[PDB]
Write a protein that holds these residues in place. Structure first.
Motif, PDB file in Angstrom:
ATOM      1  N   UNK A  69       0.807  -1.222   0.000  1.00 40.77           N
ATOM      2  CA  UNK A  69       0.000   0.000   0.000  1.00 40.77           C
ATOM      3  C   UNK A  69       0.840   1.272   0.000  1.00 40.77           C
ATOM      4  N   UNK A  83      -8.439  -9.313  -3.905  1.00 41.50           N
ATOM      5  CA  UNK A  83      -7.444  -8.284  -3.588  1.00 41.50           C
ATOM      6  C   UNK A  83      -6.858  -8.500  -2.201  1.00 41.50           C
ATOM      7  N   UNK A  84      -5.542  -8.341  -2.104  1.00 38.85           N
ATOM      8  CA  UNK A  84      -4.821  -8.395  -0.843  1.00 38.85           C
ATOM      9  C   UNK A  84      -3.863  -7.200  -0.779  1.00 38.85           C
ATOM     10  N   UNK A  85      -3.911  -6.469   0.327  1.00 41.77           N
ATOM     11  CA  UNK A  85      -3.042  -5.321   0.546  1.00 41.77           C
ATOM     12  C   UNK A  85      -2.110  -5.643   1.718  1.00 41.77           C
ATOM     13  N   UNK A  86      -0.882  -5.136   1.644  1.00 44.04           N
ATOM     14  CA  UNK A  86       0.102  -5.287   2.714  1.00 44.04           C
ATOM     15  C   UNK A  86       0.475  -3.874   3.155  1.00 44.04           C
ATOM     16  N   UNK A  87      -0.305  -3.294   4.099  1.00 42.39           N
ATOM     17  CA  UNK A  87      -0.267  -1.849   4.385  1.00 42.39           C
ATOM     18  C   UNK A  87       0.982  -1.296   5.069  1.00 42.39           C
ATOM     19  N   UNK A  88       1.873  -2.171   5.526  1.00 45.77           N
ATOM     20  CA  UNK A  88       3.136  -1.757   6.122  1.00 45.77           C
ATOM     21  C   UNK A  88       4.273  -1.751   5.093  1.00 45.77           C
ATOM     22  N   UNK A  91       0.591   2.418  -5.728  1.00 44.50           N
ATOM     23  CA  UNK A  91      -0.624   1.596  -5.556  1.00 44.50           C
ATOM     24  C   UNK A  91      -1.733   1.926  -6.562  1.00 44.50           C
ATOM     25  N   UNK A  98       2.073 -13.810   5.926  1.00 43.94           N
ATOM     26  CA  UNK A  98       0.690 -13.729   5.432  1.00 43.94           C
ATOM     27  C   UNK A  98       0.594 -13.924   3.919  1.00 43.94           C
TER      28      UNK A  98
END
Ligand code: 9XH
Ligand code: 9XH
Ligand code: NA
Ligand code: NA
Lengths: 839, 841
Positions: free
Chosen positions: B775, B801-806, B782, B819
C-alpha cells in the motif's frame, strides 16, 4: 429438516439476473416532488385559488414545476394535477456539499422565493439564475427563460440567498468569503476579506459564511451566513441591510489527506478533519453592516465583530448549531451546544453587541465604551440531559407584543425523554453583569427568567423535527401542525393542536400508511407523500377547513393527486413486520422476507441486513421495493432475509436511543441475535447454521462486531465502509455517543474492531470488507489499518474496493459490481452446496 | 491420465506447515562476507603476507571483520580462516528508509566503508552516527577490537553519504538536508559548503538539492551519490592546500509531485515525492565544484563555490542524465558518463577544474571572470557510442596514468559494436576545441569531440563481460593484464577471466566449472576470493592465490589458499530443480528450471505453477543455489505442484539483441516464450496437467502474470499478480523511456503494454485474478492497482485483492511475508490444486 441450497449460477448469469430484474426500475428511481410552496392567485373571476411550485424530476434533471389548484372539484372523479414546467434550460466543493447533504439527484437542488416581488432565485449548473412569477407580474402560462446573474468572480459561487428585505440584492459565498450582487444594478461587492484565495489551505485556514465539515456532516447545517429580514431606513431616504455570519478559524484543526478522484494524478486532497478528542474550529459571530442609498448604490460597508470574545459572551459553547433572525429582524437568535452536547442554549443577540473591526486600540477602546452595559446576550432558553441533545429545526418565534418579553415554541426530549413541543415565554432582564468593571461575567449572568412553560404535546411518542420535518404555526386560529409517531413508531402522521389551551391532538393523515407531509403557508392545504409495505409512494393534496362553530377543530378533504402511485411491482413480495418482547424490557421491531416458493420441511440460509446505529429506523411501514429491492431478490434466490431495529435506533424515545451510550458495538448484536432466535423458535425454515450478516457504514461496523463477538452464530460478515477505530472519527459524532476517549478508555477499546483483530476467525471465506477508496467521512484508513492488524494477527480476509466512490455508491457501474459481488459471495460462502462442502 | 489433487489443509494448518519449514533456516538467512579488501603486512619476520578486511554477519548486525592471510600453507590440510572482529560494541529515518529501498538492502548494520590506504583510516556509518578507526597504516596492525570513534556534529538531522577525502584523511564530507558539508575528524572543524536547500521550507517551495542523486538516478541507474572528492590536493604558496569536491546540483521545481501514503496509517496523511513519470521533465541538472582552501595546520582559510563557465545545456548538448562521474587518478580532470534522453547515445567527457568559475550574481564581476578563462579550456568528449537498442550503464571505466600530455588512455565496456558487452582499450587525442568562446556564438553538435587514436578490442564473441551489481575489472598495470567476470563458458555460470590488454587473444578462465561465481580481486592482483555455488550446493567463499610461471607472467595459475566461509552443506528438506533448455521458434535457445512434485505417482497428472519475472535486467535461471531465495518453489513441489520457471526473451546475460526483443513491445512477446517452454515440458513430461496451470510473479513478474491471464486465458486457470505496473504512463522516465521510448512516438506499444487499458480482456469467471500490492509502494505506486480496479469495476469483471499496508515495493516486515505465503498457498489450493477447486467449476 433437509437444508435448501441456492441455485449455483455463474458470475455472468447472476449479472444477467440482476440486469433483467433492474431493467424496469428506471421510472421507479426518479425523484418525487419536494420544496412545495403555495402562492394565491387573488383572481375572483378565475378557476384557481392557488398555484403550487415544486422541484421534481419528470432519468431527467431536477427542476421547478408548477400546478394549478382549483377553487372547486368534481367529487365524482379523482383529479390528477398536471405538471407545468416553470423553466426552460461538478467542482470539488460542489461534490462535497452534495456528499454532506446526501443529494443524489442532479439539477436544481433548492430555491429562494420573495413573496412581494415574485422573484425566484436558484443555482443551476455553474451559474445562478432569477425569474419572476406570481407577484405584481402575475402568472405565466408557459415555461420561463431564466436570467443569469453576471459575475466578476473567477471561482464557483456557493450558497446563494435572496435578501428578504430587498429582492434586488443577493448574497453568496466565493472562495470562503461573503459577496453581494445586485441583480438590477449589476453592482458586485466583496463583504469579507478573511480568506486569500491564492494561499494554501494549510497557511490560510480562516473562512466566513461557511459551515465547517463537522456542522455539515453531523448537525445538517450547510449555510453559515443569514440575511436580516428587514431593512432599517436611514435619514437619507436610503437603508441599511445586515448579514449575520459565522467565522471559522481552522488553524489548529488536524489536516488529513484523502485520495483525489483523479487517480491519474496520484495525488491527495487536504481536509480539515477534527477527529474525536482534537480541537474543533475556533468560532465567532460577525455582522456585515451595508449602507445603501435611495436607488441601490452601496454607500458603504462596515464589517463588525462582537464587543468581547466569543469564549466570554458564550461560556462553554463549542458548536453554533443553528442561527438566524427573529421575524421582526430585531434580534439575532442562535441555538448553541457545549462540547459534550448535553447542554443546549437559545440566545438572542442584539446587533448593538457588534462593533466596527478596528486593529487600532485607541478607536477600539472608544467603541467598546460607546456601547452600553445594558446591551448583553440573552439566554432565553436552556436545557440539559444525561444522554445527549438531538438538534432539530423546530423553533418558532412569535410577534413581540411586549418590549421586555419574548414568546416562542421549541421542541425537546430533555423533560420527558420524548421530543415534544413547548410554548415558552422569557423575560428579557437587563443583565446583572456590567462591562464597565473590567471583570468577566458569572456563568448565569445572561440567563433570562422563565415566565411560562406550557407543554403543548406529551406522551410515549415523539414529534419529528429532522430530515424536512418541522412545524407550521397558524397564528389566526392559534394552532400548530406537526409530524409524529403518536399513532405508531412504524408510521409517521400529521397532527394539529392548539398552543394556547393545549387539548387533544387531532390526527389528519389516514392510518395504515406512513406520511411525509407539508402544510401551505396559508394553513388551508397540506400535501402528503405516503406509502406502506405493499403500496408504493404517492403525493396527494388535501384541503383543510373548519366547522363554522369551532375554528380549533380542523378536518380534511381530498382535493387532488400530485403524483400517482406506480402500483404493486410484479416481482416484489414485501416483508412482514414482526415484534418481540426483549429481555431488555423493550419491544423490538423486525422485518422478515420469507424465501419465495417456500418448500415444506426444508430450511434456508439467512441474511441479516443491518444498520443498527443512531438516527435511523429501517423497520417501519413504508414501501421498501425501491431502496431495499435486493432483499426481495435475495428472497427469490432462496435466502431468508431479516432486518431488526435494535436499541440505539430512533423513533422510540431518548432512553431507547441512549441504550448504547459509551457502549457502542457492545449491545446491538445481542438484540439482533435475540430477534434472530425469536424467529427460529417460531419458524423452522430458518437454518441457524448458515447465517450471514451485511451492512454499510454503521451496518458494516456491526457486521464486524457480529463476527468478532458472536462467530458461533454468524458464518459470514460483509462489512461496508466501517469505522474500525473510533479515535479517527470526528468530534461532533463520536463525543456525543462516546464522550472523550480519556473518560471512556474501555468503551473506545471495546468499540474499535481494529484494536481487537486477534478475535477474528482463523477460517477464511467469512470476513469480506468493502470500502470507497475516496471516502472522506469513514476514511479508507479504517479499512487499511484493520487490514494491517489482521496481517499481524495472521487472520484471513477478502477485500473489494470501489476506487471512484466516496462514502455512498453514486456511479451505477460500481453499484452493479457491488450487488453482483455480494450475491455471488453469499452463493459461494453461505447459500450453495459448494459453500457447505468448503468447510 | 488421472488428476492428482493436493491435500486440502486448513488456513490454521498451512500456517503451521509454513512455520515448521521456516524454523530451521535461522543460519540460512545470514549475509556472507563482502566488500573485501587486502592490505599487505610488510613484515619480513612475520608469518602473514596480507590481512583481509570485510563486512559480514556473524541474527547479528553487519560489522567489520579481518582475517590473516599466511605466507605459506600446509598443502596436506584445508585452512579455515578465523574471523577476528575489527570493532568493539556500540555505546530508521525517512531518508535512510528510502536509500535502503533504492539500494535494495535487506540487512541491518554497516553497509559499506571507505578506507585511506596511506593512513589506515576506516570511515563507516552505523545507525545515524558516522565513525572511524585506524588499522594497517604507519601506526600498525591491531590484535584486538578497536573502539569506533564517533564523528561529532552540530547538525540536527541525519548525516547521509559519508565519504573520506583521499587527499587528506582528516577531512570527510556528507550530505545533510540536501547540502554538502565537510568535517575534520582531528580538529573538529565542521562547515557547510553548499547553501542551496532550506530544511525549514516545504519541498513544494524548495526542491533544489546539492550533491545528491535524485530518485530516478538511484532507482534506475544505481548511482546513490552526487558528489566526488578530488583525489589529490593542489599546494598553495602559503604552505597549506586546496581540496576540491565535484558535485551534481539538481532542481526538481519542474518535476511532477505525486503523493504516497505515510507509513503511520494513524495520521491518514501522505508524503510528497518528486516522481518524473514517463513523458514529463527530469530534474534540471548541472555540475558544480566547491574549492576549499586550507592553511598549514588544517584550518579552513576560505571556501569558494564555483559553477560552469557556460550552462550545462550548451556545454553538454543533448544530455539528460549524468549516469556516472568522478576524477582521473591524478586529479587533473573530472570525468562523467553522460546519456541522452532516449538512452541510445552514451558519452564519456573530461571536465577540467578550470572550466569552473566562482559563482557571481553581479554581472560586472561575472563577465570579467568569463573572459579570464582561456578559450582552449573546453569540454572534451573522449568517447561516444550509439545504438538502435539502448545503453546499459555500468561501473567499468579504468583510466591509466597519463604520460603524453596531449593524450589519454582508458578501458571501457560496450555492447554497441559487437552486440555483446566487451572490453576496449581506447586512446584519445585532446584537441584544442574548434569552438571559441570569445566569438559569442554557441558550439555546434560535435565541436568538443576528440580524435580516437586507438580502439583495440580486448575481448569478443557471443557472451558478455559483467559490469553491474558489484562486477567490475581489476587491472594489473605491471604485467598489463585485466581481470573480469563473464559468461564465456556459459550463460548459466558466471566465471573469473584474465587477459592481456596489450596483446589480447586468449582469455584464461580462472574459476572452476560447474559453479556460478561472484569474485573479487586483491588490489595487488596476487589473490582472488570467489563466492561460488551451484543448484545442489549452498554458497561458499574461498581464497585463491594467483601466480605465474617464471618465464611468462601472462600465464596465470591459481591455487586454493584457505576457506573464508564454508558451505552449509545440502539442506535435508530441499530438492533442487532441473535446468532444461529448448529450441524456440524465435531462433533462440531458452532455458528454464523444473521442480517436479515429490513422491511422484506414476500415471497421475499434477497441477502446475509457473513462476515468472521475465522483464529486463535479470536472469532467474542459472546454475546458482536456489535453496534460500526461491525456497517456497520447493515447498510447492512438496505439496504436489509442478513448478516451472523460464527466462523468456528480453531477459539477461544473453546479449543486447536478445534483450532488445521487447523494445517498444513490452507485454507482447514474453508470454509466447513462457507458453512455448511450458508446452515443450508437456510434450516431453506427461505429469504436467495443462488443464490446471497457474502463473505468479512480483513487480514485472506480476505485470506478466496479468498479461498471461489477459492474453492466454485458455492456458492459465489462475494468475496472482504482485505489485504490477498496470499502466506504463505512470512509471518513471529512465526506465520506461528506455525500453518503450517516449509515449508520443509509441502509442500502440503503451496501449498494448498497459493492462488497465485492456480491462475488457480479463476473464468474466471469478477465482482467477488475485492482485497483491504494498500500500505504501513509492516505486510501483498503488494507483496502478487501484486504477486497474477502477476499469475492472467498470467492465464488471471479478477480482480478489490483498493489501500489505506496512510494505513498500519489497516485503520487509516478517508478519507481512508470513501472510503473503499463507494466502498464496491457500489461494492455489482452493482455486487450482485441490479437489474442491475442481468442483468449484
Ligand atoms: N456522519 C454520520 C451521519 C449518520 O450517522 N447518519 C445516519 C445515516 N444517514 C443516512 C442513512 C444511511 C443508511 C440508512 F439505511 C438510512 C439512512 C442518510 C439519511 C438521510 C438521507 F437523505 C441520506 C442518507 C445519514 C445521517 C455518518 O455518516 N456515519 C457513517 C458511519 C459509519 C460507521 C459508524 C458510524 C457512522 C456515522
Ligand atoms: N526500477 C525498476 C528496477 C529494475 O527493473 N530492476 C530489476 C529488478 N531488480 C530486483 C529484482 C526483483 C525481483 C527479482 F526476481 C530479481 C531481482 C533486485 C535486484 C537486486 C537486488 F539485490 C534486489 C532486487 C531491481 C532492478 C523496478 O523496480 N521495476 C519494478 C517493476 C514492476 C513492473 C514492471 C517494471 C518494473 C521495473
Ligand atoms: Na449531513
Ligand atoms: Na536501484
Amino acid at each position: 429438516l433437509e437444508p435448501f441450497y441456492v441455485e449455483r449460477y455463474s458470475w455472468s448469469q447472476l449479472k444477467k439476473l440482476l440486469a433483467d430484474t433492474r431493467k424496469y426500475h428506471g421510472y421507479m428511481m426518479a425523484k418525487a416532488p419536494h420544496d412545495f410552496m403555495f402562492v394565491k392567485r387573488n383572481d375572483p373571476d378565475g378557476p384557481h385559488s392557488d398555484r403550487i411550485y415544486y422541484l421534481a424530476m419528470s432519468n431527467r434533471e431536477n427542476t421547478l414545476f408548477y400546478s394549478e389548484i382549483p377553487k372547486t372539484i368534481n367529487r365524482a372523479a379523482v383529479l390528477m394535477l398536471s405538471w407545468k414546467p416553470l423553466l426552460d434550460l461538478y467542482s470539488r466543493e460542489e461534490e462535497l456539499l452534495r456528499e454532506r447533504k446526501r443529494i443524489g439527484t442532479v439539477g436544481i437542488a433548492s430555491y429562494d422565493y420573495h413573496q412581494g416581488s415574485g422573484t425566484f432565485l436558484f443555482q443551476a449548473g455553474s451559474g445562478i439564475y432569477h425569474v419572476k412569477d406570481g407577484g405584481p407580474q402575475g402568472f405565466t402560462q408557459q415555461p420561463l427563460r431564466p436570467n443569469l446573474v453576471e459575475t466578476s468572480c473567477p471561482n464557483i459561487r456557493m450558497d446563494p440567498k435572496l435578501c428578504p428585505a430587498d429582492p434586488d440584492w443577493i448574497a453568496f459565498i466565493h472562495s470562503n468569503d461573503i459577496w453581494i450582487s445586485n441583480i438590477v444594478t449589476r453592482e458586485e461587492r466583496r463583504l469579507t476579506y478573511v480568506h486569500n484565495e491564492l494561499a494554501n489551505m494549510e497557511e490560510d485556514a480562516r473562512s466566513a459564511g461557511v459551515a465547517t465539515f463537522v456542522l455539515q456532516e453531523e448537525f445538517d447545517r450547510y449555510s453559515g451566513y443569514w440575511w436580516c429580514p428587514k431593512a432599517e431606513t436611514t435619514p437619507s431616504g436610503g437603508k441599511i441591510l445586515r448579514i449575520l455570519y459565522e467565522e471559522n478559524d481552522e488553524s489548529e484543526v488536524e489536516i488529513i489527506h484523502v485520495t483525489s478522484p483523479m487517480l491519474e494524478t496520484r495525488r491527495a486532497d487536504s481536509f480539515r478533519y477534527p477527529k474525536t478528542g482534537t480541537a474543533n474550529p475556533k468560532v465567532t459571530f460577525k455582522m456585515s453592516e451595508i449602507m445603501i442609498d435611495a436607488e441601490g448604490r452601496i454607500i458603504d460597508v462596515i464589517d463588525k465583530e462582537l464587543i468581547q470574545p466569543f469564549e466570554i459572551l458564550f461560556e462553554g459553547v463549542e458548536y453554533i448549531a443553528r442561527a438566524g433572525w427573529t421575524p421582526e429582524g430585531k434580534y439575532a437568535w442562535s441555538i448553541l451546544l457545549d462540547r459534550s452536547q448535553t447542554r443546549l442554549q437559545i440566545v438572542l443577540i442584539s446587533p448593538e453587541l457588534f462593533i466596527p473591526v478596528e486593529d487600532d486600540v485607541m478607536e477600539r477602546q472608544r467603541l467598546i465604551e460607546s456601547v452600553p452595559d445594558s446591551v448583553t446576550p440573552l439566554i432565553i432558553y436552556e436545557e440539559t440531559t444525561d444522554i445527549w441533545i438531538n438538534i432539530h429545526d423546530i423553533f418558532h418565534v412569535f410577534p413581540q407584543s411586549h418590549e421586555e418579553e419574548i414568546e416562542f415554541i421549541f421542541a425537546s426530549e430533555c423533560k420527558t425523554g420524548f421530543r415534544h413541543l413547548y410554548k415558552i415565554t422569557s423575560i428579557l432582564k437587563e443583565s446583572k453583569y456590567k462591562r464597565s468593571s473590567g471583570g468577566l461575567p458569572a456563568p448565569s449572568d445572561f440567563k433570562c427568567p422563565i415566565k411560562e412553560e406550557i407543554a403543548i404535546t406529551s406522551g410515549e411518542w415523539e414529534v419529528l423535527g429532522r430530515h424536512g420535518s418541522n412545524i407550521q404555526v397558524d397564528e389566526v386560529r392559534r394552532l400548530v401542525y406537526f409530524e409524529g409517531t403518536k399513532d405508531s413508531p412504524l408510521e409517521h402522521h400529521l397532527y394539529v393542536v392548539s398552543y394556547v389551551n393545549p387539548g387533544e391532538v387531532t390526527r389528519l393523515t389516514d392510518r395504515g400508511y406512513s406520511h411525509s407531509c407539508c402544510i401551505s403557508q396559508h394553513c388551508d392545504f397540506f400535501i402528503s407523500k405516503y406509502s406502506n409495505q405493499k403500496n408504493p409512494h404517492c403525493v396527494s393534496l388535501y384541503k383543510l377547513s373548519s366547522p363554522e362553530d369551532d375554528p380549533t377543530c380542523k378536518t380534511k378533504e381530498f382535493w387532488a393527486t400530485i403524483l400517482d402511485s406506480a402500483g404493486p411491482l410484479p416481482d416484489y413480495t414485501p416483508p412482514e413486520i414482526f415484534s418481540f418482547e426483549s429481555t431488555t424490557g423493550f419491544t423490538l421491531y423486525g422485518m422478515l422476507y420469507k424465501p419465495h416458493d417456500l418448500q415444506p420441511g426444508k430450511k434456508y440460509p439467512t441474511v441479516l441486513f443491518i444498520y443498527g446505529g443512531p438516527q435511523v429506523q429501517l423497520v417501519n411501514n413504508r414501501f421498501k421495493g425501491v431502496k431495499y429491492f435486493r432483499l426481495n431478490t435475495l428472497a427469490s434466490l432462496g435466502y431468508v432475509v431479516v432486518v431488526i431495529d435494535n436499541r440505539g435506533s430512533c423513533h422510540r424515545g431518548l432512553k431507547f436511543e441512549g441504550a448504547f451510550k459509551y457502549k457502542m458495538g457492545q449491545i446491538e448484536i445481542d438484540d439482533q441475535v435475540e430477534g434472530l432466535q425469536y424467529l427460529a423458535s417460531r419458524y423452522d425454515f430458518i437454518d441457524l447454521d448458515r447465517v450471514g450478516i451485511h451492512g454499510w457504514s454503521y451496518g458494516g461496523y456491526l457486521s464486524l462486531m457480529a463476527l468478532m463477538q458472536r462467530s458461533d452464530i454468524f458464518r459470514v460478515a460483509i462489512a461496508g465502509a466501517p469505522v474500525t477505530l473510533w479515535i479517527f472519527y470526528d468530534t461532533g459524532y463520536t463525543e456525543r455517543y462516546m464522550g472523550h476517549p480519556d473518560q471512556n478508555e474501555q468503551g473506545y477499546y471495546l468499540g474499535s474492531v481494529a484494536m481487537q483483530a486477534e478475535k477474528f476467525p482463523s477460517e477464511p471465506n467469512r470476513l469480506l470488507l468493502l470500502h470507497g477508496f475516496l471516502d472522506e467521512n469513514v476514511h479508507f484508513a479504517h479499512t487499511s489499518i484493520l487490514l494491517s492488524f489482521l496481517v499481524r494477527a495472521g487472520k484471513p480476509y477478502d477485500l473489494q474496493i470501489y476506487p471512484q466512490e466516496r462514502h455512498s455508491i453514486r456511479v451505477p457501474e460500481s453499484g452493479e459490481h457491488y450487488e453482483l459481488h455480494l450475491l455471488h459471495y453469499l452463493q459461494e460462502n453461505l447459500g450453495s452446496r459448494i459453500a457447505a462442502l468448503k468447510v
